[PDB]
Write a protein that binds this ligand. Structure first.
Ligand SMILES: [Mg+2]
Lengths: 231, 222, 250, 244, 233, 240, 212, 235
């Protein structure tokens, strides 16, 4: 109200409204799902078009051979944060001959977003990210919020109507975690999860975007006829 | 006074065929009269069907290859996973080298692969980034021993057709990958005999449309 | 962090007034009375040592300050602002003059430097004006004795005699009746003590009054002998006893 | 953060006026009147000190008339402290030019430089403008005797006769009435003092309330002399012209 | 650009079937003056890596602090700091190699020759060299300074190529290393009798041996040597 | 440094600081530009509220940027000097590096670029100035006339006016200027320019300035008497 | 290395050899010493190979940006000055360059500028640069006329490089010929010096000193 | 006042949303992509008849294989065009090749959100970037001040955009010829323009693989306008 003019102002109840407004941009964004087993980790994203002449906005970005994310909210902010991750993944490899741990990647994203919430002149990031990866401790899924809060999960969803997919994953938890050594079945579970968030529209060939990373699987994105198999 | 440069010896050789290319190099690494390693790889697969070697001062050589490999990675990020063509890689390496024009990478760089028509390609660089597409190029310690042999046996220089006595040149017939490898092995065997910094092992990387293949051969260890 | 106030805090209002300067002058008006009188053979500057507590040692608080051996200053308004201005004035006398010409600046030019500093606090980014008016008395070879007033705006004026602060209006009228161009230094000191008594409520003695003069050279205060051309400072602060002696002939 | 307290000194009004410039001009209208009159054989600068005191040391006092070099002088109307900042800058510019070209700076080039400095404070920096209007009186071998004025906007114009400060409307009408092109310095001295005498807010015009200066080729032969009048000399010219 | 002041001589090392061995004497020379006799030049990092350093000792102590800081930094926000996300020999080397080349590129080198010896997560032997120029190389045997000239020839007789590594036991390897240290003591004028030896094995882990001495020395034949040519008495 | 964003968008998509800079131009004295077949004429209004002015030394309204290009303006006088100085520096820089004087279009594009920059840079306000830039390209006999404004947009004109009452003189020009047959001589072009200002000016005395620019750096300013003869001939034809 | 360029009735002839050496060692016989800046502009390589290659490709980029901004072909004067101003910034740092910037525009006609790494920029009709420049000058000066035909001019340039290739140890390999017209340059082939020498010797009757 | 980079309660940047309103006031620009080429057309919208309309430059070349049309505060586009041209040429210098149309568009969009308290505000202009490369063929992109870019088969921006886009929705199919696209742009421009469309107040352009980017002569466009009139009178 009087305390939402900038990110440097607490409200009388201890809230940061600019951060909360940045969180609101994610809720307007298109739905994207993340889930993993012990061998693989999967991203599924519902891409959004402007109209029938337009392309469908890409949702998934590769960060390294073993890591990548999906976005929901301001796309340019995802480009900035994903670029930062690419550099950090790259610094780790060049200097230490070491693949960057997914947990450490989450810590770096948290700290970068935090600085934009405590200083004058700047603004919080207006995007939510779902990071998947396979490192020395197996498969991982992270959820990033521009408040700075990063959380490690078995599965999750962000964006508009994401609550339906999140409840489904909460039910299916015991089943999909056990899908080891079977990439197609893990993706099926993800495609079924994101379907719980659809209304009026359904998953078409230029609508659906899928990514996967695992034990002997580099981070690869599937679009177009490559996802027709899962429709 | 601190000398930032050194000489790690070594000799490399690139040859472009009709639909293939080879980049070869010995595996010996030295300083002065000592051997550091009998097997230290010098020719590298850099992705996108491109092989590279930066011969001379190994610290600079490793640095350049590392930065070029990195450039290939970022080319993919920035340009929708587009394949970096050999000509584009060559121009990129010029800028990497000329970027240190006044404190140069003390190396002689050669890359090999296939051009956009599928034909064999070799590019050769000086330390500060001047480059050219070539059919045949040796680099490093025993380059002066190898090139004249290649002028004669690859390009048939000074060879004429018997009976004509200098009137008709020996026609420039194309060489197979098996034929090129023979000339590479004989080039390095000969260089090993007469150059003290050449020996131990020979590693050849062959590039075709099918990808990058490796071959290794022993060289004399004295 | 960083000083993000790079904009002026003093600005023209629709009526053409510079508010912060006017308000600084109001702060000066609330300040304790100080005065200055110029004689033919000297200048006197005086003020009241308004002690904040009787437990406080008011000798440790110097309202009258030496700027150069031949220049002294007194104020009315905010004491802390004065103290830092004295520090800057002492330094600028060296950096912008003595280190260049090998001699101390003339009164008018030191006043000009202090005035410039006060003007800049009136236009520079993220600062308020100084809440003081200064009275600067001094002597130099070619201009003789002089007395200047410097205001928060940076404006300065030369005076034969004047007063600033609390009871300045009444004090200036008192000085107008007494001043002439034939006064000796002792006459000016006498008039100063008379004028200052009117604006003082409580105790009026050497311990509650601070008074200094710009007069003859004091070779006894030089600290060394052997150089004929060096004859000592013209600035001298009167002692508590010296003031009380002149209060009997009052 | 800090934006909250920013007055924004360099913005247009909806009418396309610069607030701070307009308000600075309002400030200058309350300053003592300064007048400049250009003649064929010299220039006159006359200016009124603001309500003075009997205890003010006049002979060592300077608030209106300042020397920029041997050929150029200025009359000030507005904040004296602001004026001295600009005056010192102008004195440096004149010396920079003299060092560079080994010739005295032409009057207009000096005027343009100071005017550009004023302009800058209205367009960038976020600082308040200088609350000063100048009258420039000067001579060079290109245009001869010249009068200019500049104000807080950084705009400058040339004049045969001009006033700044208080009561400029009344002053300019009086100058426009009695000024002629073939006028001489001694006549211009009289016009300036007569104009101040009629426009002044004081009860009477006396020597202690005035600063006076002339720029004459009344310097022995082919050269120019500046004369900042002393208190006694102002008193004499007041009697000569029949004002006291 | 500087010059080395207090210096350490040869570091020697070799691979064997189950791991690596590395050794270095305990001397800090000051030109020809054998100034400091208790200097440890093998510095362990965790339980899988030993970094052996020759050359300038002040720079060695700086590098020692960098490695100590590296361990601290790796443990930050790292629940698997003592398991899957522990420092590898390959990580430690690549870091040092980066630093060495950067420093030479600013014309202000760390005046050292370094050998990183260790065993990787998968049990693989790690042995690689880096020096003040940022030059790097790997070999079944590695040695610095005088060791390169005198130790390598002896160690290469045990492991002459890659295929000799599985045939070489830890007893044979240690024996060869200890003999090489004796030869260096005979022939290097900036060496000492006292040395340290470290074994990094994929089964038995890191064994660090301090206060070792060169023994079984041959000197008796000196009594028969007289003059420089013709002298009989 | 002072970094405050003074030029910003409003809910209706307007940048008020740029639009208020146009209001400053509306206040400025009228300027007009007319191009003939082999010349361009720049006419300027001088407000007669200021007499006792010294016209020898007072800043003239038309400024030479180079020997072949001129610039006039309407709006804040002090602001215009900054644009004129920058343009003059750029003109010499172009001659120094390209070894050829600026084209009229290039010089216009540069000035317009400066104006635009001041509409999205921190801590600065836009220029309260619109300009008319006229001249001939090197070794070219085709007349050139361009206009710029505070936003930074620029365009070429057969004839154009800016400043106060420019709506009226543009009305006149739009019905009196024929594109198929522009003023064939210097006389005809100057006459049409003076006529256009007489719709707005008041007295045809010292209120009208006229500058004629011809090809090959041939630039001359008309005097009071020369202009007065045009003023006389126009009204004598009007009395009919 | 020998490179020449001369103005004539039909435009400009550019001719260069093809040899690169490192000391006595012949590094290459197939070097491209004419840099194709764009379809209308040519530059020659002498001094530092990298310095010439890098900065004359860079020049092509600046020329392309010019014509995008100005909607007009860049003048040879302006193009050459961009390069000379650039290398003048680097003066003292150790750039090594001796080049002829060659072009043919409407306003200038055929134009050649000698540009050089110590900042020199000279317009002229005939220039020769390299270790074998003196030999090529001799043939050029004694046979040059403005009213040469395109055929004869091309031969003159070819013959002058041959003269240098013969005598100068650090020149040879092959001869590259170009003909610059207003509508752009035209390549006139690579000519091996070994084969060219004998061909010229027989047909011309020159080089009687050499046994063939 | 309030920050230039402030979020609204709906999670939108105030300044970006307000710049979109300025673009709505701009003159209409239309792009249509086909397998034979991409056509770009604009409304010139001269403010007076004395303004020489051929000096109105709202269609611009970025490189031989990339063209661009603008709508909104067109003065803001100049630095964007400069950056685009530099990016295209710089990439060719570094990589000895043409730059991809998407990569060029992405580079331009990276400037967009570089504002705060960098430039003091977002750009007040939208761009239609049309081009061809070997990997993805003929392409048309819509670059906004938000930093977002969408690829389009056809797109209209400016004051008549929503009416034009509805028209493009019905008319576009994957088999359009270049000639059909030219007439289609002319037809829709004529529909949404205030003044009557002719060769002086409207401009056409295209990008083909063979000939590259070309701005059409007024004589060439005049013929296409006459061809349009006759075919609309044909039924
Ligand atoms: Mg050998």
């Amino acid at each position: 109200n009087n305390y939402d003019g900038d990110t440097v102002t607490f409200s009388p109840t201890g809230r940061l409204f600019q951060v909360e407004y940045a969180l609101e941009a994610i809720k307007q964004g298109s739905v994207t799902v993340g889930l993993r087993s012990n061998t693989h980790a999967v991203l599924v994203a519902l891409k959004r078009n402007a109209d029938e002449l337009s392309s469908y906005q890409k949702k998934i970005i590769k960060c390294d051979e073993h890591m990548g994310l999906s976005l929901a909210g301001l796309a340019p902010d995802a480009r900035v944060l994903s670029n930062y991750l690419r550099q950090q993944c790259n610094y780790s490899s060049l200097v230490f001959n070491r693949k960057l741990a997914v947990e450490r990647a989450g810590h770096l994203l948290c700290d970068k977003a935090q600085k934009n919430t405590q200083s004058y002149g700047g603004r919080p990031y207006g995007v939510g990210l779902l990071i998947i990866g396979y490192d020395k401790s197996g498969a991982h899924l992270l959820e990033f919020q521009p408040s700075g809060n990063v959380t490690e999960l078995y599965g999750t969803a962000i964006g508009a109507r994401s609550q339906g997919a999140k409840t489904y994953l909460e039910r299916t938890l015991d089943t999909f975690i056990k899908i080891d050594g079977n990439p197609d079945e893990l993706i099926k579970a993800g495609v079924e999860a994101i379907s719980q968030s659809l209304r009026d529209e359904s998953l078409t060939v230029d609508n659906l975007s899928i990514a996967i990373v695992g034990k002997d699987t580099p981070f690869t994105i599937y679009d177009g006829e490559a996802v027709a198999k899962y429709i | 006074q601190f000398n930032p440069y050194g000489d790690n010896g070594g000799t490399i050789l690139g040859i472009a065929g009709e639909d293939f290319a080879v980049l070869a190099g010995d595996t010996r690494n030295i300083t002065d009269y000592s051997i550091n390693s009998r097997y230290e790889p010098k020719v590298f697969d850099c992705g996108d069907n491109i092989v590279m070697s930066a011969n001379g001062f190994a610290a600079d050589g490793d640095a350049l290859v590392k930065r070029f490999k990195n450039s290939v990675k970022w080319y993919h990020f920035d340009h929708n996973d587009k394949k970096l063509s050999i000509n584009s890689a060559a121009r990129n390496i010029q800028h990497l080298l000329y970027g240190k024009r006044f404190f140069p990478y003390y190396v002689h760089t050669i890359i090999a692969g296939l051009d956009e028509d599928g034909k064999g390609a070799v590019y050769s660089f000086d330390p500060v980034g001047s480059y050219e597409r070539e059919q045949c190029r040796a680099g490093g310690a025993a380059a002066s021993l190898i090139m004249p042999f290649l002028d004669n046996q690859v390009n048939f220089k000074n060879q004429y057709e018997p009976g004509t006595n200098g009137k008709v040149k020996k026609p420039l017939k194309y060489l197979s990958v098996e034929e090129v490898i023979k000339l590479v092995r004989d080039s390095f065997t000969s260089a090993t005999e007469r150059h003290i910094q050449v020996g131990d092992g020979l590693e050849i990387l062959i590039v075709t449309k099918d990808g990058v293949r490796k071959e290794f051969y022993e060289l004399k260890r004295d | 962090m960083t000083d993000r106030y790079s904009f002026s805090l003093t600005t023209f209002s629709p009526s053409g007034k510079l508010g912060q300067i006017d308000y600084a002058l109001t702060a000066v008006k609330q300040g304790v009375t100080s005065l200055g009188i110029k004689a033919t053979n000297g200048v006197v500057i005086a003020t009241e040592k308004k002690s904040s507590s009787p437990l406080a040692m008011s000798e440790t608080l110097s309202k009258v300050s030496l700027l150069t051996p031949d220049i002294g200053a007194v104020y009315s308004g905010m004491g802390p602002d004065y103290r830092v201005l004295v520090d800057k004035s002492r330094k600028v006398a060296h950096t912008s003059y003595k280190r260049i010409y090998g001699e101390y600046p003339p009164t008018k030019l030191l006043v000009s430097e202090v005035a410039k500093i006060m003007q800049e606090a009136t236009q520079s980014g993220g600062v308020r004006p100084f809440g003081v008016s200064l009275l600067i008395a001094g002597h130099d070879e070619f201009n003789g004795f002089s007395l200047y007033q410097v205001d928060p705006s940076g404006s300065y004026f030369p005076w034969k005699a004047t007063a600033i602060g609390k009871g300045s209006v009444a004090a200036k009228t008192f000085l107008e009746k007494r001043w002439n161009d034939e006064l000796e230094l002792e006459d000016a000191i006498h008039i100063a003590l008379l004028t200052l008594k009117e604006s003082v409520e409580g105790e009026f003695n050497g311990d509650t009054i601070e008074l200094a003069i710009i007069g003859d050279e004091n070779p006894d205060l030089l600290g060394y002998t052997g150089i004929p051309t060096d004859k000592g400072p013209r600035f001298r602060k009167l002692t508590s006893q010296e003031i009380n002696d002149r209060l009997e002939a009052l | 953060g800090s934006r909250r307290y920013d007055s924004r000194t360099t913005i247009f009004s909806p009418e396309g006026r610069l607030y701070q410039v307009e308000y600075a001009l309002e400030s200058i209208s309350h300053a003592g009147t300064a007048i400049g009159i250009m003649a064929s054989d010299g220039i006159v600068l006359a200016a009124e000190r603001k309500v003075t005191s009997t205890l003010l040391e006049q002979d060592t006092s300077t608030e209106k008339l300042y020397k920029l070099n041997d050929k150029i002088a200025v009359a000030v109307a507005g904040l004296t402290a602001d004026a001295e900042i600009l005056i010192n800058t102008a004195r440096i510019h004149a010396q920079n030019y003299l060092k560079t070209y080994n010739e005295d700076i032409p009057v207009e080039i000096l005027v343009r430089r100071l005017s550009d400095i004023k302009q800058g404070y209205t367009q960038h920096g976020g600082l308040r403008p200088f609350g000063v209007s100048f009258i420039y009186a000067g001579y060079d071998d290109r245009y001869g005797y010249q009068l200019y004025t500049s104000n807080p906007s950084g705009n400058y114009t040339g004049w045969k006769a001009i006033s700044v400060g208080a009561n400029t409307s009344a002053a300019q009408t009086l100058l426009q009435m009695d000024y002629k092109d073939d006028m001489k310095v001694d006549d211009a001295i009289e016009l300036a003092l007569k104009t101040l005498s009629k426009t002044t807010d004081s009860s009477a015009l006396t020597y202690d309330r005035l600063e006076f200066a002339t720029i004459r080729k009344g310097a022995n032969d082919g050269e120019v002399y500046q004369k900042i009048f002393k208190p006694q000399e102002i008193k004499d010219i007041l009697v000569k012209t029949g004002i006291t | 650009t500087q010059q080395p002041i207090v210096t350490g001589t040869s570091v020697i090392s070799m691979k064997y079937d189950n791991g690596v061995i590395i050794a270095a004497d305990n001397l800090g020379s000051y030109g020809s003056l054998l100034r400091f006799n208790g200097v440890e030049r093998l510095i362990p990092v965790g339980d899988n890596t030993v970094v052996g350093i020759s050359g300038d000792i002040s720079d060695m102590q700086h590098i020692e602090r960098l490695l100590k800081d590296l361990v601290t930094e790796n443990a930050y926000d790292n629940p698997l700091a003592d398991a899957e996300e522990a420092l590898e020999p390959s990580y430690i080397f690549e870091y040092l190699a980066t630093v060495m080349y950067q420093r030479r590129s600013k014309m202000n080198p760390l005046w050292n020759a370094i050998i990183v010896a260790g065993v990787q997560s998968n049990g693989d032997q790690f042995l690689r060299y880096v020096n003040l120029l940022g030059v790097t190389y790997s070999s079944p045997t590695l040695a610095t300074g005088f060791g390169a000239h005198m130790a390598n020839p002896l160690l290469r007789k045990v492991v002459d190529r890659e295929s000799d590594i599985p045939k070489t036991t830890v007893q044979v390897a240690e024996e060869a290393i200890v003999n090489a240290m004796r030869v260096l003591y005979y022939r290097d004028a900036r060496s000492s009798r006292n040395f340290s030896l470290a074994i990094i094995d994929k089964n038995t882990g890191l064994t660090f041996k301090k206060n070792l001495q060169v023994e079984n020395m041959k000197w008796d034949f000196a009594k028969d040597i007289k003059g420089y040519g013709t002298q009989k008495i | 440094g002072y970094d405050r964003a003074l030029s910003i968008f409003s809910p209706d998509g307007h940048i008020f600081q740029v639009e208020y800079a146009l209001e400053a131009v509306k206040r400025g004295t009228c300027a007009v530009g007319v191009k003939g077949k082999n010349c361009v004429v720049l006419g300027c209004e001088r407000r007669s509220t200021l007499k006792l002015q010294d016209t020898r030394i007072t800043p003239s309204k038309v400024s030479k940027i180079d020997s072949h290009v001129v610039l006039s303006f309407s709006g804040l006088n002090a602001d215009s000097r900054i644009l004129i100085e920058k343009a003059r520096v750029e003109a010499q820089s172009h001659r120094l590096t390209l070894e050829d004087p600026v084209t009229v279009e290039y010089l216009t594009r540069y000035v317009a670029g400066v104006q635009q920059r001041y509409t999205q840079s921190g801590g600065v306000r836009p220029f309260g100035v619109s300009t008319l830039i006229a001249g001939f390209d090197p070794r070219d006999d085709e007349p050139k006339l361009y206009q710029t404004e505070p936003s930074g947009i620029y365009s070429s004109w057969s004839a154009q006016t800016i400043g106060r009452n420019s709506k009226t003189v543009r009305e006149f020009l739009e019905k009196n200027y024929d594109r198929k047959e522009p003023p064939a001589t210097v006389e005809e072009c100057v006459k049409l320019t003076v006529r256009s200002l007489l719709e707005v000016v008041q007295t045809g005395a010292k209120n009208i300035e006229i500058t004629v620019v011809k090809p090959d750096s041939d630039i001359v300013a008309l005097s009071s008497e020369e202009i007065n003869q045009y003023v006389t001939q126009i009204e004598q034809e009007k009395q009919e | 290395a020998t490179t020449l360029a001369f103005r004539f009735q039909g435009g400009i002839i550019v001719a260069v050899d093809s040899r690169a050496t490192a000391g006595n060692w012949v590094a290459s016989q197939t070097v491209k010493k004419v840099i194709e800046i764009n379809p209308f502009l040519l530059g020659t390589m002498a001094g530092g190979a990298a310095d010439c290659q890098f900065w004359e490709t860079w020049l092509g980029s600046q020329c392309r940006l010019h014509e995008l901004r100005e909607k007009e072909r860049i003048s040879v004067a302006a193009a050459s000055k961009i390069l000379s101003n650039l290398v003048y910034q680097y003066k003292g740092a150790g750039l090594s360059m001796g080049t002829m910037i060659c072009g043919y525009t409407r306003k200038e006609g055929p134009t050649i500028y000698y540009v050089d790494s110590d900042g020199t920029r000279l317009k002229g009709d005939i220039f020769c640069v390299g270790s074998g420049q003196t030999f090529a000058y001799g043939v050029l000066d004694s046979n040059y006329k403005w009213d040469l035909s395109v055929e004869d001019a091309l031969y003159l340039g070819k013959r002058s490089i041959l003269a240098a290739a013969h005598r100068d140890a650090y020149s040879g390999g092959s001869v590259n010929l170009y003909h610059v017209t207003e509508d752009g340059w035209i390549y006139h082939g690579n000519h091996d010096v070994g084969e060219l020498f004998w061909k010229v010797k027989e047909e011309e009757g020159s080089f009687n000193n050499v046994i063939g | 006042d309030r920050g230039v980079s402030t979020f609204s309660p709906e999670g939108r940047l105030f300044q970006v949303e307000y710049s979109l309103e300025a673009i709505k006031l701009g003159s209409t620009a239309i792009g249509i992509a086909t397998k034979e080429g991409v056509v770009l057309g604009v409304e010139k919208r001269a403010t007076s008849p004395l303004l020489e309309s051929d000096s109105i430059e709202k269609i611009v070349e970025i490189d031989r294989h990339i063209g661009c049309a603008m709508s909104g505060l067109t003065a803001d586009a100049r630095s964007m065009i400069e950056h685009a041209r530099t990016a295209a040429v710089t990439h060719n210098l570094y990589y000895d090749e043409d730059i991809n149309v998407e990569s060029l568009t992405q580079s331009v969009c990276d400037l967009a959100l570089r504002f705060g308290e960098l430039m003091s505000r977002p750009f007040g202009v939208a761009l239609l970037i049309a081009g061809h490369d070997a990997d993805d063929g003929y392409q048309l992109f819509h670059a906004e001040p938000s930093g977002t870019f969408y690829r389009y088969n056809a797109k209209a921006i400016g004051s008549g955009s929503e009416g034009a886009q509805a028209e493009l929705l019905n008319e576009w199919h994957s088999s359009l010829t270049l000639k059909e696209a030219e007439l289609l742009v002319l037809k829709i421009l004529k529909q949404v323009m205030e003044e009557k469309l002719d060769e002086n107040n409207a401009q056409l352009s295209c990008i083909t693989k063979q000939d590259g980017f070309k701005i059409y002569d007024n004589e060439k466009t005049a013929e296409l306008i006459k061809e349009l009139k006759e075919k609309e009178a044909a039924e």
